[PDB]
Symmetry: C3
Subunit: 256 residues, 3 copies
C-alpha cells in the first residue's frame, strides 16, 4: 500500500502538463491504470476536448494496483501544484475508493516534505474516442511559431481560418479594423530540425476556429517545442504536443 503511488523525478513535468491545459477546462477526470495515466476534460460548450496520456516510462516510480478515476477541479489542482519547487520529487498517492488525492513534494536532500491533500469531485466518466483514422491534412511546426501566429491574428478577429493547399499553409483573420494573412511554406532544415515545417495533404482544407480556444491550445508549448495538427473537414482538429512517453491532445470543433 498505498494502492496508487506515481513518483515523478521532478515536479516540473506535471507542473508543465497542467499548465498546458489548466486555462481551458474547469473539471478533469484522471484515470490511473496499471499501464500509466490518462485524462480527459471538456469545456462548458463541448467544443474542446483535452486528452492526456502519461506512460509508465515518464515516472521514476509507478505503481497502481487497480484503475481509479479521480475527478479534480483545475483551480484547486493548479493552486496545489504551484506549491512545489521544480526539482522536488513529486508523488501522486491514492487509496481505494478515495475521497482525496495526496501530492507529496520531497526535497532532494530530505530536509523538508510538503504533503497536500486535494478533495475529489464526483464526475460521471464518459470518455470519448473521437480520434479519426485519416485526416484530410497533417502538419507540424514549432510551437512558438504557432503561438506567434495565433496571438497576432487574435487581435483582429474572434475567428482564425486555417487553409491548406499543396505546399501552402495559411492562417487568416478578418475583423473590423482590418485583416491578416500569414502564409508559411513547408521546409526541412537539416541545420535545425526543430525549425522544420512539415505538411502532408491528402485533401485541401478550409476550417475556422474560435481564437479564444486556439489561444488556450497554444499553451501546450510548455511541453514541446513542436506541435502537430491534423485537420478534417468532417471532424474536430487535433493539436498534439508530445512527451517523451505520452502526449497532450486538444480536439477543437470547427465553426460551422
Amino acid at each position: 500500500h498505498h494502492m496508487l503511488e506515481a513518483k515523478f523525478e521532478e515536479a516540473s513535468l506535471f507542473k508543465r502538463i497542467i499548465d498546458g491545459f489548466k486555462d481551458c477546462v474547469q473539471l478533469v477526470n484522471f484515470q490511473c491504470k496499471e499501464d500509466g495515466i490518462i485524462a480527459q476534460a471538456v469545456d462548458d460548450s463541448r467544443v474542446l476536448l483535452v486528452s492526456l496520456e502519461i506512460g509508465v516510462e515518464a515516472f521514476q516510480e509507478y505503481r497502481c494496483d487497480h484503475p481509479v478515476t479521480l475527478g479534480m477541479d483545475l483551480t484547486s489542482l493548479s493552486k496545489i501544484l504551484a506549491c512545489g519547487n521544480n526539482t522536488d520529487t513529486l508523488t501522486l498517492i491514492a487509496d481505494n475508493t478515495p475521497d482525496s488525492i495526496i501530492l507529496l513534494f520531497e526535497d532532494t536532500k530530505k530536509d523538508r516534505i510538503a504533503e497536500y491533500s486535494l478533495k475529489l469531485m464526483d464526475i460521471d466518466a464518459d470518455f470519448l474516442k473521437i480520434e479519426e483514422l485519416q485526416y484530410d491534412s497533417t502538419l507540424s511546426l514549432p510551437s512558438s511559431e504557432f503561438s506567434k501566429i495565433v496571438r497576432d491574428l487574435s487581435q483582429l478577429s474572434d475567428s482564425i481560418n486555417i487553409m491548406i493547399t499543396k505546399e501552402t499553409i495559411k492562417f487568416v483573420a478578418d475583423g473590423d479594423i482590418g485583416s491578416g494573412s500569414v502564409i508559411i511554406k513547408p521546409f526541412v532544415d537539416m541545420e535545425h530540425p526543430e525549425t522544420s515545417i512539415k505538411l502532408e495533404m491528402d485533401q485541401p482544407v478550409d476550417l475556422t476556429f474560435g481564437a479564444k480556444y486556439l489561444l488556450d491550445i497554444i499553451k501546450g508549448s510548455s511541453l514541446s517545442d513542436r506541435v502537430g495538427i491534423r485537420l478534417s473537414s468532417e471532424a474536430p482538429a487535433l493539436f498534439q504536443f508530445d512527451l517523451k512517453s505520452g502526449f497532450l491532445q486538444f480536439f477543437l470543433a470547427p465553426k460551422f
Copy 2:
C-alpha cells in the same frame, strides 16, 4: 505599381516610432510624399501635437508616386504593428485613393509572409506649422533621466513646473502629500557624450505642464537616448527625439 511602397529593413524601427506616441493620440494622419513620410496627430483637448518626419534615407526601399494622406486609428495600427518580428522586413503599401493600407512582414529566409490590411479613416488634414524660430531656452539631456524625473515628480502632482535660469535646470511638483524639486546642472562629459546635459538660455523660463502628458511624451525614449527641449513663454514647448533620418516631436501647451 503599387503607388506607394516603403520598405523598412527591420520592422523594429516603425514599431518603436509608433510606440513613441501611440498612447497620447487616437487618430493620426500620415502623409507619404516623394521625399518621405510625415505625420501629425492631436489629442482630444488640443494641448498636444505629435509631429513625425521619416526621411527617404530611413528606408531600404522607398517609392511614392504621388502624395497621399492616410488616416489611421492608433489602436488598430498598434495592434497590427505588434504582429511582426523585430527583424522582419516591413513594407507599407498603398494604392491611389486607398480604402486601406497594407503592411507586409517578410521573413529574412523567405519562409513566411504576414500580410495585414488596415482600414483607413476619413480625417480632414489640417496640418499645423506652430514651430517657432526662436525659443526662450533650449536644453538636451538623456531621455532616461527625463523619464526618471517625470515619473518621480508625477507621483506628487498633476502638474510639473520647468524653471530655467542660467546654468540651472529645475523641475518642481507640489501636491497634498508634499513637494519635490529636481535640480540638474549642465555639463559636457567627454568620457560619455551621451550623459551630457546642455543648455542655452536667451531668457529664463518658468512653465507648467500636465504630468499626464509628460508621462506620454517620455515614451519617445524608444527612439533616442537623448531628448531636446525648447521652451517659450508664449508658445508650446517642443520635445524632440531624433532619428538617423527624421525626428519625433511633441508640442505641449503650458498651463495658463
Copy 3:
C-alpha cells in the same frame, strides 16, 4: 543646524526598510534620537505591530540634536522614497517642531539633487514594549523559504498553523479545496550557513496566524536572507529580520 541630519550612503537601504513593511500599515511614528532611529506602526485591527531600529552605525553621517517624533503616511512616504536611485546619497532632514521632513537625494558626481518635502501627520505616540523575556520556541531559517511556505499555504486557507515539537517545525493550512502540511527539519549546513534551519524548544507550540498578515511579514526578506521567529502560547509571535546595525520586527497576535 539643521537639528536632524541622517545621511545614508545609499538610498537603497531605507528604500528596502520601507519596502519591508509599507504594505501592512497606513501610519508610522518614527522617533529620531541622539542614538539612532526607532519606529513603530500598528494596523487597523491591532493584531500586527511593526518595530524598527536603525543604529547610528547604519548611517555614514548622523546627527540629531533632540529626539523628535515624525508621523508619516506610508503611501506618501513610499511614493517619495521611490524617487531616488539606489546608489544616491539619501539624507533625512528635520527642524525643531517640524511640519514636514525633507528627503535629499544627491548624485555621486554632484550633477543633480532631488529634494522632497513630506508633510507630517499628528499621531499620539503610545509606543508599546510587548517583547517578552522568554518565548516557548525560537527558530531561524532562510527568508526565501519562509516566503515560499507562506505563499504556498496561503492559496489553501485564510489561516496558517505553526506547530513546533522537538526537532520538528511544521506549517499547516486547511481549506475547502484541501489542505497542506510542510514539515522542515533543523540542520546546520557548514558548506552554506545561510541555508541552516535552527530550533530551540523550551516548550512545544501550536499557533494559528492570519495568512493575510504573514504574506506581508515575509516582505522583510528585502532586508535579510534569514528570519528569526519567536513563538509563545501567551503572546504575539516575533518575526525579526536583522540589519547590520538594527532590525525590523513584526509582532503578530495568534488567532484565539
